[PDB]
Every structure is written in C-alpha cells, then in structure tokens.
Design a protein around this ligand. Structure first.
Ligand SMILES: CCCCCCCCOCCOCCOCCOCCO
Ligand SMILES: CCCCCCCCOCCOCCOCCOCCO
Ligand SMILES: CCCCCCCCOCCOCCOCCOCCO
Ligand SMILES: CCCCCCCCOCCOCCOCCOCCO
Ligand SMILES: CCCCCCCCOCCOCCOCCOCCO
Ligand SMILES: CCCCCCCCOCCOCCOCCOCCO
Ligand SMILES: CCCCCCCCOCCOCCOCCOCCO
Ligand SMILES: CCCCCCCCOCCOCCOCCOCCO
Ligand SMILES: CCCCCCCCOCCOCCOCCOCCO
Ligand SMILES: [Mg+2]
Ligand SMILES: [Mg+2]
Ligand SMILES: [Mg+2]
Lengths: 289, 289, 289
C-alpha cells in the first residue's frame, strides 16, 4: 500500500533590517508531500519506507526533488529504522514546545548542532553516504529513543565521527518529563549535548514548562527556556522567555497565537526577539491534506 | 486529500531543414503529472496546493523533477493564489484557440514575452525568488483575472520590474469576447502588451474567431489571427491565418485535424507555415489519465 | 487512472577487501516507486505512461528524482512502447534466473554491455536524446520481443550507432527455452551479442537450467552458466556455477537462499565468488507495496 500526505503553508515573514537592499517582509511558503509505502503481514510485523518532496520559497532552481529514503520494521511497540532516520535528540517530547507562529519557530529551541531527519537533498555531497539506525520503544506513557548516525558509512569506522543519541519521555494527564543526551552531536568531536525538560498541564486549557539544555561546543553555552500556552475555545495563546550563557546576550522572548479555523486548517502568528536583539514576526496559514 | 492527474502524448514532429546534421523528423513526447493537495472546510473555504512533474523529450539529464509550488484559497467564486501562479494574459479565454496538432501549437498565438505558470525547474537560477499573487473571480458567464508577479521578491521592490496583468472574458451560447492587458510583461520595462478577441459559434458544430494583439517590445509588432474550426462527428478540422507587422514577414497559416478516438484519447495532426517561411508538421496521440 | 507501486529493501552487503580505508561491509538499501498512468478505452486499446523514482544508498546529493518517461499502447496481446523502453535482451525469460541474494545479483548473468530500461536520470548528459521503440507479442506460451534504440535521435541517423534486438521465449509446464540476439549492443559498433538458454522443472519444487552467451566485444568472451533452485516450503535454495573464456579466469559460483516471510516480504542472502576471485556476500529483506 502507498499513501500520500502533507501540508501547504503560506504567509508573511518579517525580519527587522534583513540586509542592505533586501525587503524586510517576504511571502514565505512551503509545500511538503510525504510518500509512504507499507507492507503489513499476518505475523504482526509491519515494513515501511518513506520519501519526502519538500519545496520552500527561495529553493535553488525553483524545483523540488525527493530526499534520501528511510526504512522501518515495527513489531509490538518496537520500531527499528534505517537510512535517513529520526534521531533521539530531535524526537523526544517537550523540546520544541515553545515554538509558535505559522513556521513553528522559537529562539527558545536548543542552540546546538545535531543530526536530524533530512527533509531535502544536499547539493554539497556531504550526505551521500550518510546512514543511521534508530530504535524506538513505546511502552505505555513511556517512550525510549536510541539513534546512531554514521555520516559516511563507506569509509573505515575509526576515521569518521559517529553520533550516538539516547532519550526518554514520560507523561500522565498532568505532568510530563523528558531528557536526552547525544555524544559527538552533528559528527563534531566532543560536541556533547543534553536536555532535560518538564511541563505541567495546570488545567484542561493551559500548560507551563521549562526546558534546560547543555549546548555542547556551541557559543551559546547552557540555556533555559520557560514557556506557556493557553487555549480559549479555538484560539491558543503562546509565550516564552529564554536565556543563554553567552556573554552579553539579551533575553529572548516571544508571544504568538493560533486560531483553529477548521479541522486541518490553522492560522498562526508571532512576534519574537532574539539573543542579539533581532526582531522577527510572522502571520500565515497551514492546511493539512 | 491528495489527487494525481495528468497526460501522456507522443508522435512525430517535423521541422523542415531543422539544422546541419540534424534529423528533420523526431519522436516528440511529454509526460505530465499534477499532484494536488486540497483541504475542504465546513465554512466553504477550500485550501489547495499543487506541484507538477513534467518530462519532455530532450530534457537535460534524462530526468524529471517537480516545479515550484502554487497555493490557493477559494471561497464563493473568488480564488486567491500565491507562488507559481497562473497569470492573467495566459489564463483569459480565446487567446490560444487557434492552436492545433498534438502539441497544441500555432504561429497565430501572441508573439510577445510574458510570465506564465512555470511547468518545470529553471537551472539558470532566475526563478529562485520568483513569487506571484493572482486573483480570479468567476461571476456567471464572466471571468475576471488579475495577476502580479515579482521576479525576485527578496530584493527591494524599487530595484526590480514587477509584472501587473488584468483580463476578462465573457460568453453566452453564441458569442465570446475577451481582452487582456499586462504592463512590464515578462519583467521587461515598457513591454506593455494587449489582447482583444471575439468568437462566434456559427452553429452547434463550427466556430470562427479573430484575435488581435499589441506585442509590446517584440519585433513582431501588432498581430491579427483569424481562425476557425468545425466538428463532423468525432473529427474536428481546424485552420488559421495570422499576420504580424514586422517588415517583410510572410503570412502564417495552418491546417489540422483532431480525432476523438475515445473519452480522454485524442489523435491530432497539423501542417503549419511560419512568419519566416518555416514549415512544421506533426501527428500524434494524447491520452488523459 | 494513476497507480503507484514499488518496493523497499535493506540489508548488509559485504565485499571482501573493498578498498584501502573502506569498510568491507555496508548497509545497502533501495527505495523504488513506479508511477503508472493508464487510459483504458471501450475499443480495447489501452494507453499507458510510466515514471520511476528510485533511490540507492550512495546516490549523489542524497536525493531522488524521476527518470525519463516510457509510453505504450496495447491491443490484443500486442504492445508497442516508445521512449525509455524495455529492450529485447533484457526482457527475455531465463537470462537472469541464476540471480540470488536480496539484491538479485549473479556473476552468472551475461558479461556484455547492452541497453536496458534506465531506472534513473544520467548526469553525464549521455541519455538526453535517447529514444527507443519496442514491440512485444505474447501469443500463449510464446513471447516475442523486438527493440530498436537510437541513443541520440536528434542527430542524423547515419552518424550514430543504433541498437537492434530480437528475442523469444517459450514454455510449457516442464521445459522452457529462450534465445536473444542484439546487434551493436549498447550503441557499440560490432558488439553483437547472443543468448540461448533452457530450463527443466524437474519437479513441482526444483528447476535446473543452462544459459550460454556470446558476449560480443567484452573481454569475457563466451560464457556458460549452470544453475538450479529448490523450494522446501517457504525456503528456496539456489546455486550456480559460471565459466567465461577469458584467459586465466576462475570459475564463478554462488549459493544462496530465500525465505518467504509473508506475501510480499522476502528475506534473502547469498555468498558468491567471482571470475577474479572476488568474494561477495549479502543478507537482507525486500518488501513490496
Ligand atoms: C537527485 C535529486 C536532485 C537533486 C540534485 C540537485 C543537484 C543540484 O546541484 C548541482 C551542483 O550545484 C550546487 C547547487 O546549489 C545548491 C542547491 O540546493 C539548496 C536549496 O536551496
Ligand atoms: C507587514 C509586516 C508584519 C507582518 C507580521 C505580521 C505580524 C502579525 O502578528 C502579530 C503577532 O500576533 C500575536 C498577538 O498577541 C496575542 C494577543 O492576545 C490574544 C487573543 O488573540
Ligand atoms: C498588491 C501588491 C503586492 C503587495 C504584496 C502585499 C500583499 C500581501 O498579501 C496578500 C495576499 O497574500 C499573502 C498572505 O496570506 C495572509 C496571511 O494570513 C491569513 C489571514 O490572517
Ligand atoms: C531540485 C530539482 C532538481 C532540479 C535541479 C536540476 C539542476 C541541474 O542543473 C545544475 C546546473 O547545471 C545546468 C543544467 O542545464 C540545464 C537543465 O535544464 C533544462 C531542461 O532541458
Ligand atoms: C514523416 C514526417 C511527416 C510527419 C508529419 C505527419 C504529418 C501528418 O498530418 C498532416 C496534417 O493533417 C491535416 C489534414 O487536413 C485536413 C483534412 O480534411 C479533413 C478530414 O480529415
Ligand atoms: C523502425 C526503425 C525506426 C524508424 C522510426 C520510425 C518509426 C515511426 O514510428 C513508429 C511508432 O512510434 C511512433 C509514432 O506514433 C504514431 C502517430 O500517431 C498515431 C496514429 O495516426
Ligand atoms: C532533472 C532531474 C534531476 C536530475 C538532475 C541532477 C543533476 C545533477 O548533476 C549536475 C551536474 O553534476 C554531476 C553529478 O554527479 C553525478 C550524479 O548522479 C549519480 C548517482 O549517484
Ligand atoms: C557481517 C558480514 C557478513 C554479512 C553477510 C551475511 C551473509 C549471510 O548469508 C550467508 C549466505 O546464506 C546462504 C546459505 O546456504 C544455504 C543453506 O542451506 C539451506 C537451508 O537454509
Ligand atoms: C550498533 C552499531 C552500529 C553497527 C552497525 C551494525 C548493525 C547491524 O545491523 C543492525 C540493523 O540494521 C540492518 C540489517 O538488516 C538485517 C538483515 O536481514 C534480516 C534478518 O535475517
Ligand atoms: Mg520561507
Ligand atoms: Mg518534444
Ligand atoms: Mg546499495
């Protein structure tokens, strides 16, 4: 069986004083199509393969292509994936929950470098022999994630830096906890990064959380992000504040809102301020199909 | 929801004395696939996104890729589209009705340069930040079209030439009228082009029309195309004559026929003569799927 | 109508002493998606078009694209195809039946150069004007194949070498015979190649066959491959031995097995030895979707 799914989004993206001779406000948009092939068996083992075709405004050649494939095998809550895999630091819960606006962005996201699923081709040639293995285990309320990425699998193993990641999250109706650790993140020797977060659903309607990171070799140093969101019917209001250890950095913050226009159609906007005083804003729509 | 549609065509394409050491007759063919994602809402607003994958004989690398995305929102007869849009001069009725043969070609089509939906990627890099907005309004028998294209939306607005177009058409059972005007067509300063056309369905079976153009900065100058077609059961016969103002040009003309082999399968052929005496012919099949 | 089908495969591929500083064992995988558009008519003539998107580990840019299109028309057992066609030497029965392992490989396959369907784009530009015509006729038990490939159809016909192929196979419940001949195979003047094979289903469970080739200008010279396979319930065991005329070559051989895990899911592995003493092994899974 083959299924197709995806989303389109478009809106306005503003970056205060973007550059000499550049418009500060542009129309930013994205089309994402996922192609998933799955083979179910009566033994209960499912096999799957996925390809993505994603276009973003500004993409070279005004064209769209597929990325590198991902393959998986699932059985009894356990999933093993190979190729262009989802990594542990990128898949744990809570770590991206301060994002807002129609492009799901936040200065409060981790300021470190690490491997993650590659949505597109890479013209530099750097990903040509990139290969990962990931294992996930979902055991009710608990999620475990393990990932191993070799950026160049054809070359002798001791000549390249491989990334090893581990993560777990846990939740009930009111509290959630999550932690992750990755050594040689992004294939950079000694770039060891870590995350610990927690969130409290202080209602049926609100949530408040705190994420802490060790950003490894990044110049940002350690980081803390405090965020919250509250739903009033179809409208959701979001906010965050984030601090990094880099000398002289400003406190980053953001405020945004979402409006659920219909099932699968969401209008979102945000106004945010960065660690170097950058001001960014956006307003747009995303529709899922 | 995601749907796929398209067409394949193949046949013989003859160009008298095509070039030293070249075959005059080749097998010309095209595969077009459209991928359309749509999200309908109970409020009556539809959201859509489309991508095209088109291959033509001769394409570089013997490969096929997607083009840049188009997004739209429709409500009550009004459609707003963004990104790789259909433009007013290219979407009005009548302007391409002298086309014939299995590749829908005619020297009687406008001999001007203007933006239109881009079916493929562009390796020159020229379309990378190209972005348009279009608005169409279909109000029974009447169609209005407006389009605005900025060929490089990231650069300051006064540093690039944007194309603005407007058009309308109108029809009843027997007469049709259409007009279009576009300033700085193709992003070329002062290339202002215009079209006015009319057609008469002088039966249930025949139609005769006349299109007039102002080709802006093109060397062709003003142009007039007179065409007609007549259906005899499954067979359609077509003809046209066209004249341009360029000094010394020949009168262009063409004669062709279509045969409706089955629903979605059409066999077509034509013999045509250009403004510089070029002789071209074709015969082939198109099938829609 | 548009349908999608394909397969994913992944596993381990070992090549003894692959190269200085290279891993001998890698994770080799492939994702293949076929997109087929078909138009059926009440006259009984079917029209079709197909595109393939295939990714293999190691592919340049870590991306996937479509290949060049193939078009066909079928009526009463006869199929005419144009564009990126299947060729006679590549489509006859028996010629690849010694293959084994999850990548369907065998040193006992013909060691000659010839055109075949191109699964991917070609960055060299060599296939840009490549165009073939093929005709197949399936007349109960009998299959005839004819193919003509012009590697550069736009250039004068006497300036390029075209490949012409013919083949036939025939089978009943127990015996199968097949033969093929291709002149100027691969567009190489005087590279004339030929195949003759036969197989005997010495049970409901086993088969033994012998293929002979004339490899044209290849340095391998003539070749003979003897192979067999036997099914024990869900498990199939395969073997082959092959000899070429090249001076000093070793006898190539291979032994493998397949396990039918479920409909559409097959686990396969093989250990093989080449004409230059290369040792190769593989174990993996293929799943069809
Ligand atoms: C096989 C899938 C198609 C992907 C191949 C595209 C290869 C194009 O690059 C060739 C080398 O030139 C470098 C291109 O510039 C960077 C492009 O991508 C960045 C997205 O905006
Ligand atoms: C023309 C350039 C500016 C384009 C940016 C659009 C920015 C618009 O969005 C502003 C951010 O929206 C957040 C509002 O704060 C929440 C208000 O109170 C909650 C109920 O709506
Ligand atoms: C008319 C000249 C072009 C100047 C361009 C400015 C046009 C602004 O956008 C108009 C339509 O397209 C884009 C944005 O989508 C709107 C955002 O979110 C939805 C409703 O709150
Ligand atoms: C991202 C979609 C893939 C499109 C990228 C292809 C880029 C190839 O070009 C790289 C630069 O070299 C120039 C190519 O020659 C022109 C090709 O297109 C013309 C169609 O026949
Ligand atoms: C071998 C090179 C020539 C390939 C070109 C094929 C050209 C064939 O088509 C000729 C054009 O067909 C138009 C006929 O005029 C209409 C006739 O009367 C109407 C009822 O059929
Ligand atoms: C046999 C040597 C190759 C010489 C090539 C000429 C072959 C001509 O075309 C044969 C089949 O393929 C293409 C054309 O489709 C026919 C056109 O329209 C349909 C019926 O009127
Ligand atoms: C139009 C479909 C996209 C295919 C175009 C890709 C073109 C990229 O090449 C541009 C020129 O540079 C040469 C690339 O190196 C070889 C790539 O393919 C081999 C597969 O591993
Ligand atoms: C770690 C590198 C080695 C990876 C190669 C895996 C090779 C494994 O497969 C060995 C080949 O399998 C063939 C067995 O011979 C058939 C046995 O008897 C029949 C019933 O199973
Ligand atoms: C753990 C460090 C990484 C070392 C890589 C070796 C891992 C070997 O493969 C594990 C999973 O992925 C690949 C192979 O599929 C297995 C083959 O066939 C199926 C069962 O017989
Ligand atoms: Mg953008
Ligand atoms: Mg063509
Ligand atoms: Mg491989």
């Amino acid at each position: 069986m083959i299924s197709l799914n995806g989303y389109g989004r478009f809106g306005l993206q503003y970056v205060e004083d973007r550059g000499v001779g550049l418009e500060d406000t542009i129309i930013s948009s994205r089309l994402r199509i996922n192609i998933v092939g799955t083979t179910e068996t009566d033994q209960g083992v499912t096999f799957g393969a996925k390809l993505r075709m994603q276009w973003d405004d500004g993409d070279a050649f005004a064209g769209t292509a597929g990325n590198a494939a991902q393959f998986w095998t699932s059985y009894n809550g356990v999933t093993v994936s190979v190729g262009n895999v989802d990594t542990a630091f990128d898949s744990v819960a809570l770590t991206y929950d301060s994002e807002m606006g129609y492009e799901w962005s936040s200065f409060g996201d981790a300021q470190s470098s690490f491997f993650a699923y590659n949505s597109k081709y890479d013209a530099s040639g750097a990903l040509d022999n990139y290969n990962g293995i990931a294992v996930t285990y979902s055991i009710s309320g608990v999620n475990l994630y393990l990932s191993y990425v070799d950026p160049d699998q054809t070359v002798d193993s001791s000549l390249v830096t491989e990334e090893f990641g581990i993560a777990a999250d846990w939740s009930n109706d009111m509290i959630s906890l999550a932690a992750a650790y990755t050594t040689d993140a992004g294939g950079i020797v000694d770039n060891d990064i870590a995350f610990v977060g927690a969130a409290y659903k202080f209602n049926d309607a609100g949530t408040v959380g705190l994420n802490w990171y060790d950003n490894g070799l990044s110049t940002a140093g350690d980081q803390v992000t405090l965020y919250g969101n509250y739903a009033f019917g179809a409208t959701t209001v979001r906010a965050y504040v984030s601090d990094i250890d880099r000398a002289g950095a400003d406190t980053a913050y953001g405020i945004g809102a979402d409006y659920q226009f219909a099932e699968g159609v969401k209008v979102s906007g945000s106004v945010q301020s960065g660690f170097a005083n950058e001001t960014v804003a956006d307003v747009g729509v995303r529709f899922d199909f």
